[PDB]
C-alpha cells in the first residue's frame, strides 16, 4: 500500500472544501435566516461546537468510527491517532488525510444542527448535546455505513452521506425543533443566505467528488453529477414555486440548490448523468413539498431539516434505482437485484432515522437534566 | 490515452474555482453595484440562469461546442453525454472533467451578462435570451476557438477566453444596455463589490491556470502571469485615477483588478512575466479610459461590459505581440510572423463582436416578441 | 530534478488559498473591526498594497529573498525572473510555482499590517512604508529563514512563518500603533469579522500544508495539526473568556482561531497531533492574556498584532520542544538536543523582533519625512 501524491493532493484540497462548508458556509446560511439579535450567538455556537467536534474526532471519534470493532462501533486503538504511523496508507492516500477528510463530514453534520437551534438552546446545553450525539449517533452511523459495520456489510449504497450526514442531522434537528423552538419572521439578510448557499455548493464538490478517495473517473462522475443534480433541483424547485406561488424567490432558488445537493449526495458516484438530472428534479420538487408541509406542522429556521430529511430519503431510495447499469449507473454488486437493493436502502434509512432520533432525544434530555435546555 | 490523476485532481479543483466565479463571485460583484431594491431579483436570475446553463450544457451544449462537426458547430453525438465512456480520456484527463471544466466557462460568461441586466429584464425573457444566446453564440464561438473550428484552424491564440468569454459577453451586454436599460445611482454596498471582485480573482486562477488542461509548466506560467497582470492593472488603473481624479477609489481598485484579469485571459499561457506586466498596465489604463467613455454615451452597471470588452480586445491584440519568443513568450507557431498573428487576432475579435452582437439582438428580439423584454 | 505534476497541482492550489487569505480574508477581518467611515479607504489600501507587493516580488523580491547570496540577502540574478527557465525545477515543482507560493506569503504579511493601520496613515505614506519594509525586512528575514541564510544555517525551525510572517508583521504593526494611532469603539460588523476569520482559516490550509512543498506525509501532518491546533485554541480562548468574563463572545471565538493558526504555523510540519493540541490550548490562552495586556497599554484594531506577536513567539518556542521524537514530533536534526534547539528558537525570535522593529521605524520615519505619515 503506497500513497499516490495526486490522490493525497486531491483529498487534502477536498477536505479544505468540506471544512469551508461549515466555516463559514452553514453559519452564513443560517445567519441570514434568523433574527438579527440572535446572529452573533449562533455564529459563536457554530464556531465553538465546530472546534469541539474537531477535538473529539482526533481524541476518539476517528478511532470509534473507523477502527475495526463490531457492526456498530470501532475501537479505542487509535486514541489521539496513536499507533497510526505517519506514512500509514489507507486506500491510496496517507491515513492522516483520511482522518481529516472524515472529520470534516462530522463537522458539517453538527453545523447543520447547531446553526438552526442555537437561537433556542443554552450555550452549555448545546455543548453537552454535541458530545452525546456525535459520540452515540454520528460515530456509530459512520461506522455502520462507511466503517465496515452493519449497513455496509449488507451492501448499502451511500456515496457521500445521505444517511450519515443529511438524514442523521435532519432527524436530530427535527427532534430538537419539536422539544424546544419558539411556536408562532421573514429572513432578514437574503444576500447572506445566498452567500452561504454558494459556499455550501462550492464546498460540496470536495464533499461529493472527494468521497471517491482518489482523483479517478468516479470522482469525475460524482463531480459532474453534482453540477447536474444541483441545477436540475434549482429548476424543479423554481418551477414549482412559479406554479404554486406565481413567481420564483431567492430563498426558493437557494433551497432548490440544497435540495439537489442533498438528493445527489448518496447517489453521486453510482449513477449516470441522466439519473442525476432525474434525481435533481425530483429532489427539488420533494424539497418544496417538504418545507411546505413541515411549515404546516411547525419560529426557527427548519428549512434545512425539511430539505435535508426529505431529500436525503429521496436520494437514498433513488440510489437503489439509478445505480442500475440499465439506467446508466455503475451497476449493483454481483447478484444484487434492484428489488433487493431498494430494500437495503429503505432499511438503512429506517435505522438511521430511529437511531439518530433516539440518541438526539437522550442528548437533549441529558442537557436539560444537567444545565437546562432552553436558553435562560 | 491514459488519464493522469494529478491532472484530474488539478482540473476538478480548477473547475470548482471557475464555478466559484459565478456562484457567488459575479452575483456579489453586481449585487453591490445595483439599487438595493433590485438585489434579490438579480440574485435569483443569476442562480436560475446558472442552473439553466448547467443543464443545456450537458443536454447538448458540450456536444455542439466540442464534438467534431464543421468550422462553426460540433454535432449531436454526445447528447446527455451519450457515447462518452466513463473512462474516456481527453488530453491527459477524463473527458467528464473536460465536460465540467468547459461548462463552467459557459456559466461565468452568462453570469457576466445576467447580473448587469437582471434589473431591467422580465424573468421569462432572460430565460429565453439565455437559451438563444448560449446556443447560437457561446456554443459556436467556443467551437470555433477551442473546438477545432474556424478561428483555431487559422491559428488564433486565446488561452482562456478573451474572445469566447470576455468580448462575447461584453457585446451581448452592450446590445442589451442599448435596447433596454434605464436612461439617466452611486453603488450601495462597496464592501460587497470588493468581496465579489476577490472571489472572481481567486476563482480566476482555476480559469487561467486550468486552461492548460494539466498541472505543467504552462499552468505555472499562466498562474504567475495572472498574479502579475492583475497587480499591474490595479496599479495602472489607480495611478490614472489619482492623476485624473486626485485620489484612488475602492471601485477603481476592483475595476483595475478585473481589467488585468480580463486583459491577461487570452495571453496568460503564451507570454512572459514581462509581457504580463506590460499587458496589465495597458489593460488597467484602457479599462479606465473605456468606462470613462462608455459612461459618456450611457442607470445600470455597465462597468463590467466596458472593462470586459475593451480589455478583452486589448488582451487579444497584445497576445499577438507578446507571444513572440523575442519578447519572452512561448513563441508563435512554425512559419508565423508577428504581423500574420496580429492579423489573425484582429479577425478573431471582429468575428466575435459581430457574431455575438447579431445573436444577442436576435435573442432580445425573440424574447420581446414572445413575452416582452422590459420588466413589467 | 524533474517536476512531479501532483506536487505542481497541490502547490498552485495552495498558492491560490494563500492569496485568498489576503484577498479578501484579512480585508474582511479588519473591515468588520474598524469604524464604518474608514472601511472603504482601508479596503483600497489593502488592495493597492497587495498589488504593489505582487509587482515588487517578481521585479526583485523573489531574487533577493531566494537567490543565493550571503547570510542576509540573495542576489539580483533573477530580476523579473530572468534566467529562470520555464521548466526549471525547485524541489519537486516548477520554480515558477515556488515564486508564486513564496510571493503569496509576502502578501499576507503586508496585509496584516496595512489592514489595521490604513485608518491612520496617508495613502502615499503606506506605499512608501511597504516598499521600505518589504525590501529591508520581509526579504532579508525570508532569506535568513527559508533562503539558506543566517537562521536556517543555524538550524532554526519555522515550518510556515512564525517568524517571517507572524512576528515580523506584529512588530512592524506595533511600532506603527505606537507612532501613530488614535489614543482613547466596539466592532461594527462582527458577521464580517467571522467571514474574514473563516476565509483566513480555510486559506491557512494552503499556507500550512503547502509549506511542505509536496503532497506528502508532512503536508498531511501539517494539515491535521492545523485542524487540531485551531480547534484547541478556540476552546482555550473561549474557556478563559467564560472564566474571566462569564460568557464567550464571537470576537473571542474568532481571535482564538487566529491564535491557534498562528501558534501552530512554525510547528505544524514538525510536531505530533498531541503537540498540536497542547500548542493550540496554550496559544489561545496566551492570545487572550496578550490582547488583554496590550489593551491595557494601548483606537485602532491591534487585536491581530497582539495575537500574531504573542502567539508567534509561543509557537516558535514550543516548536523547539514538541519537534522532539519523544513527544511525537518528527525529531530534531542529528546531534541537536532540545536545549540547543530552544536556544536557536529564541535567538531567531530575538533577531526577527529587532530587525523588523528597526526597519519598520525607518520605514515610518522615511514616509513621514517625505509625505507625512498621519492621514491629512
For residue B186, report the phi and psi dihedrals to the nearest 5 degrees.
Answer: -95, 130
Of A48, A54, A55, the CB nearest to C253: A48
- What is d(CA B179, CA A322) in angstroms, rounded to the nearest whole number? 46
User: In angstroms, what CA-CA distances link A151 with A99, A212, B53?
Assistant: 21, 18, 38
**Which chains share 3+ C-beta pairs under 8 angstroms with B?**
A, C
- B317: contact with A, CB 8 A cutoff: no
- What is d(CA C38, CA C34) in angstroms, rounded to the nearest whole number? 7
| CA-wise closest residue to A56 among A141, A136, A152 | A136
What 8-state DSSP symbol labels residue C94?
E
List all residues 6 or more positions away from C243 whose beta carbon is below 8 Å from its beta carbon: none
Q: Do A54 and C220 touch (CB under 8 A)?
A: no
C-chain residue closest to A36, CA distance: C191
User: In angstroms, what CA-CA distances link C65 with B268, C17, C22, C57?
Assistant: 25, 22, 21, 9
- What is d(CA A247, CA A252) in angstroms, rounded to the nearest whole number? 10
C-alpha cell, B313? 480586445
**Cα-based angle A184, A185, A188 (whole degrees, multiple of 5):** 165
Q: Determine the residue among A227, A230, A322, A331 to mutate to test chain B binding: the one whose Cβ has the most chain B Cβ atoms within 10 Å.
A: A227
- What is d(CA B220, CA B233) in angstroms, rounded to the nearest whole number? 20
Of A24, A48, A96, the CB nearest to C217: A96
- C219: contact with A, CB 8 A cutoff: yes
- C270: contact with A, CB 8 A cutoff: no
Of C20, C27, C80, the CB nearest to B202: C20
List all residues 6 or more positions away from C41 whose beta carbon is below 8 Å from its beta carbon: B250, C118, C119, C123
**Total residues belonging to chain A:** 376
| CA-wise closest residue to A192 among A336, A59, A43 | A43
- What is d(CA C291, CA C311) in angstroms, rounded to the nearest whole number? 11
3-class secondary-structure state, position C88: coil
Cβ pair B100, A224 in contact under 8 A = yes
Q: Do A9 and C220 touch (CB under 8 A)?
A: no
| CA-wise closest residue to B312 among B352, B274, B278, B344 | B352
- Which sequence spans correspond to the domains of chain A? 1-376
Place of cell 462569564: C246
| B309 burial via Cβ count (<10 Å: 0-12, 13-18, 19+) | buried
List all residues 6 or more positions away from B344 whose beta carbon is below 8 Å from its beta carbon: B151, B154, B155, B156, B157, B320
Cβ pair A217, B96 in contact under 8 A = yes
- B100: contact with A, CB 8 A cutoff: yes
HSE value, Cβ hemisphere, 13 Å, CA-based, for B236? 29
List all residues 6 or more positions away from C339 whose beta carbon is below 8 Å from its beta carbon: none
List all residues 6 or more positions away from C237 whose beta carbon is below 8 Å from its beta carbon: C252, C253, C255, C256, C259, C284, C285, C287, C288
Chain A residues with CB inside 8 Å of B3's CB?
216-217
- B235: contact with C, CB 8 A cutoff: yes
| CA-wise closest residue to A196 among A111, A126, A293 | A111
| CA-wise closest residue to B280 among B242, B331, B323, B318 | B318
Place of cell 440544497: A258
According to DSSP, the residues that pair with A374 across neighbouring strands are A121
Task: Compute the nearest-CA separation of B244 from chain A (Å).
Answer: 35
Q: Do B277 and C103 touch (CB under 8 A)?
A: no
| CA-wise closest residue to B330 among B173, B159, B85 | B159
| Helix locations, chain C, DSSP H | 5-20, 27-33, 36-56, 62-66, 95-117, 123-133, 139-146, 150-153, 168-179, 190-209, 217-245, 250-264, 273-294, 303-322, 338-370
Task: Compute the nearest-CA separation of A286 from chain C (Å).
Answer: 32
- What is d(CA B154, CA B145) in angstroms, rounded to the nearest whole number? 9
- B281: contact with C, CB 8 A cutoff: no
**Which chains share 3+ C-beta pairs under 8 angstroms with C?**
A, B
* End-to-end Cα separation, chain A, in angstroms: 54
For residue C271, report the phi and psi dihedrals to the nearest 5 degrees.
Answer: -105, 170
According to DSSP, the residues that pair with A121 across neighbouring strands are A374
Task: Output the CATH code of domain A1-376.
Answer: 1.10.3430.10
Chain C residues with CB inside 8 Å of A105's CB?
none
DSSP C219-271: HHHHHHHHHHHHHHHHHHHHHHHHHHHSS--HHHHHHHHHHHHHHHTTTTTTS
Q: Confirm or deny that A211 is annotated as ligand binding.
A: yes
List all residues 6 or more positions away from C43 whose beta carbon is below 8 Å from its beta carbon: B190, B191, B194, B250, B253, C27, C31
DSSP A218-268: HHHHHHHHHHHHHHHHHHHHHHHHHHHHSS--HHHHHHHHHHHHHHHTTTT
C-alpha cell, C65? 529573498
Q: Do B97 and A10 touch (CB under 8 A)?
A: no
**Cα-based angle A309, A312, A313 (whole degrees, multiple of 5):** 85
- Which residues of B are part of a known binding site? 211
Task: Compute the nearest-CA separation of B53 from chain A (Å).
Answer: 8
Cβ pair A75, A156 in contact under 8 A = no
Of B201, B235, B274, the CB nearest to C52: B235
**Which chains share 3+ C-beta pairs under 8 angstroms with A?**
B, C
- A44: contact with C, CB 8 A cutoff: yes
Place of cell 429556521: A301
Q: Determine the residue among A250, A259, A274, A328 to mutate to test chain B binding: the one whose Cβ has the most chain B Cβ atoms within 10 Å.
A: A250
C-alpha cell, B298? 450611457
- What is d(CA B13, CA B57) in angstroms, rounded to the nearest whole number? 19
CB atoms within 10 A of CB B22: 28
Q: Determine the residue among B7, B16, B56 to mutate to test chain A binding: the one whose Cβ has the most chain A Cβ atoms within 10 Å.
A: B16
**Which is it for strands A93-94 and C93-94: parallel, antiparallel or unpaired?**
unpaired
According to DSSP, the residues that pair with A212 across neighbouring strands are none
Peptide bond into A24 cis (omega under 30): yes
Chain B residues with CB inside 8 Å of C188's CB?
none
- Which residues of B are part of a known binding site for NH4(+)? 211
**Cα-based angle B229, B234, B235 (whole degrees, multiple of 5):** 100
Of B8, B20, B54, the CB nearest to A228: B54
The most distant pair of C-alpha atoms in chain C lies apart, rounded to whole Å, by: 60
**Cα-based angle B57, B62, B63 (whole degrees, multiple of 5):** 125
3-class secondary-structure state, position B94: strand
**Which is it for strands A93-94 and C89-90: parallel, antiparallel or unpaired?**
unpaired
For residue A354, report the phi and psi dihedrals to the nearest 5 degrees.
Answer: -65, -50
Amino acid at each position: 500500500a503506497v500513497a499516490d501524491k495526486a490522490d493525497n493532493a486531491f483529498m487534502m484540497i477536498c477536505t479544505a472544501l468540506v471544512l469551508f462548508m461549515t466555516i463559514p458556509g452553514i453559519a452564513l446560511f443560517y445567519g441570514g435566516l434568523i433574527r438579527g439579535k440572535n446572529v452573533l450567538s449562533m455564529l459563536t455556537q457554530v464556531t465553538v461546537t465546530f472546534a469541539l467536534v474537531c477535538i473529539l474526532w482526533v481524541v476518539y471519534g476517528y478511532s470509534l468510527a473507523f477502527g475495526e470493532g463490531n457492526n456498530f462501533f470501532g475501537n479505542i486503538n487509535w486514541l489521539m491517532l496513536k499507533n497510526i504511523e505517519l506514512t500509514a496508507v489507507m486506500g491510496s492516500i496517507y491515513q492522516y488525510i483520511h482522518v481529516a477528510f472524515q472529520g470534516s463530514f462530522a463537522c458539517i453534520t453538527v453545523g447543520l444542527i447547531v446553526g438552526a437551534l442555537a437561537e433556542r438552546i443554552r450555550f452549555s446545553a448545546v455543548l453537552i448535546f454535541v458530545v452525546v450525539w456525535l459520540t452515540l449517533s454520528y460515530i456509530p452511523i459512520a461506522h455502520m455505513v462507511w466503517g465496515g459495520g452493519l449497513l455496509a456489510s449488507h451492501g448499502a449504497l451511500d456515496f457521500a452521506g445521505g444517511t450519515v450526514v443529511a438524514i442523521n442531522a435532519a432527524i436530530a434537528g427535527l427532534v430538537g425543533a419539536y422539544l424546544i423552538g419558539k411556536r408562532v419572521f421573514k429572513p432578514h439578510n437574503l444576500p447572506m443566505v445566498f452567500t452561504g448557499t454558494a459556499i455550501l455548493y462550492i464546498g460540496w464538490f470536495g464533499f461529493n467528488a472527494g468521497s471517491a478517495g482518489t482523483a479517478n473517473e468516479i470522482a469525475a462522475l460524482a463531480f459532474v453529477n453534482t453540477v447536474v443534480a444541483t441545477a436540475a433541483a434549482i429548476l424543479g424547485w423554481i418551477f414549482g414555486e412559479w406554479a404554486l406561488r406565481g413567481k420564483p424567490s431567492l430563498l426558493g432558488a437557494c433551497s432548490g440548490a440544497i435540495a439537489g445537493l442533498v438528493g445527489v449526495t448518496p447517489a453521486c458516484g453510482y449513477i449516470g448523468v441522466g439519473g442525476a438530472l432525474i434525481i435533481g428534479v425530483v429532489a427539488g420538487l420533494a424539497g418544496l413539498w417538504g418545507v411546505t408541509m413541515l411549515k404546516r406542522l411547525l419560529d426557527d429556521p427548519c428549512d434545512v431539516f425539511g430539505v435535508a430529511g426529505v431529500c436525503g430519503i429521496v436520494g437514498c431510495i433513488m440510489t437503489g434505482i439509478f445505480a442500475a447499469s440499465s439506467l446508466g449507473g455503475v451497476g449493483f454488486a454481483e447478484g444484487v437485484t434492484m428489488g433487493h437493493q431498494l430494500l437495503v436502502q429503505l432499511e438503512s434509512i429506517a435505522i438511521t432515522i430511529v437511531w439518530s432520533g433516539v440518541v438526539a432525544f437522550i442528548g437533549y434530555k441529558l442537557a436539560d437534566l444537567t444545565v437546562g435546555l432552553r436558553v435562560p
